[PDB]
């Protein structure tokens, strides 16, 4: 709605005035990485540089929200009745990376657009890599269907051929 897009510009303004970089992930990342938006979302999925941490919190209390629960990997928040699903990145050679994630996780150039402005956002790579985990939770065949197209949307996106290597590199990372 315009509620989550005129705040996903206010968050980026303020981080922009900061020059603190913020990553969007998930459905956004999706929508913003086609330019178009494809069905209402829940939250909004963040990536952040984690040894900046304070700088988003400092933005989202600026904003009138607050930090509502830690979470294994990462954080919760709250702007008014919009969550912000918050994930650190930490500065890896010459990048920031999510944690386990592929490498290019967090380009520097905005390469998703969200009302007309570019934004930055993980990459394909990234977002498809948290299905797999997802997937491991859940077998893909009961997922609710929300997340069965969002995850054959991105796939389209990047190539069911890609997707499949990819596959069976996080199957040979965390396979026992
Ligand atoms: N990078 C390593 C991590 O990747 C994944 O986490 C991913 C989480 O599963 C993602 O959170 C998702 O799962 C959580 C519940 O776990 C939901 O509350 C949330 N709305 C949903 O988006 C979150 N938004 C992104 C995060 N990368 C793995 N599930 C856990 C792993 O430690
Ligand atoms: N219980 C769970 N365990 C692990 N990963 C999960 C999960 N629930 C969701 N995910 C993963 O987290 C990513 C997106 O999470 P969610 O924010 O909850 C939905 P979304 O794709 O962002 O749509 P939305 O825009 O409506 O929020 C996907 O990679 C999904 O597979
Ligand atoms: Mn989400
Ligand atoms: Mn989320």
């Not at 984690?50 to 919190?57: F, H, P, V």
């Not at 592929?102 to 998703?112: F, R």
């Not at 956002?121 to 299905?131: G, P, V």
Request: charged share 30%.
């Amino acid at each position: 709605d315009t509620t989550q897009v005129t705040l996903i510009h206010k968050i980026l303004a303020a981080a922009d005035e900061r020059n603190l970089p913020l990553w969007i992930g998930g459905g956004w990342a999706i929508d913003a990485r086609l330019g178009r938006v494809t069905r209402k979302h829940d939250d909004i999925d963040l990536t952040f540089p984690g040894e900046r941490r304070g700088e988003l919190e400092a933005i989202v209390e600026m904003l009138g929200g607050r930090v509502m629960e830690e979470l294994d990997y990462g954080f919760l928040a709250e702007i008014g009745d919009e969550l912000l699903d918050c994930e650190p990145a930490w500065w890896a050679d010459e990048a920031y990376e999510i944690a386990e994630a592929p490498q290019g996780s967090c380009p520097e150039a905005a390469e998703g657009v969200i009302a007309g402005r570019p934004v930055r956002c993980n990459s394909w790579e990234a977002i498809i890599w948290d299905y797999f985990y997802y997937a491991d939770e859940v077998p893909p065949v009961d997922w609710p269907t929300k997340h069965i197209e969002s995850y054959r949307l991105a796939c389209t996106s990047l190539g069911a051929e890609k997707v499949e290597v990819l596959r069976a590199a996080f199957r040979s990372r965390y396979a026992a």
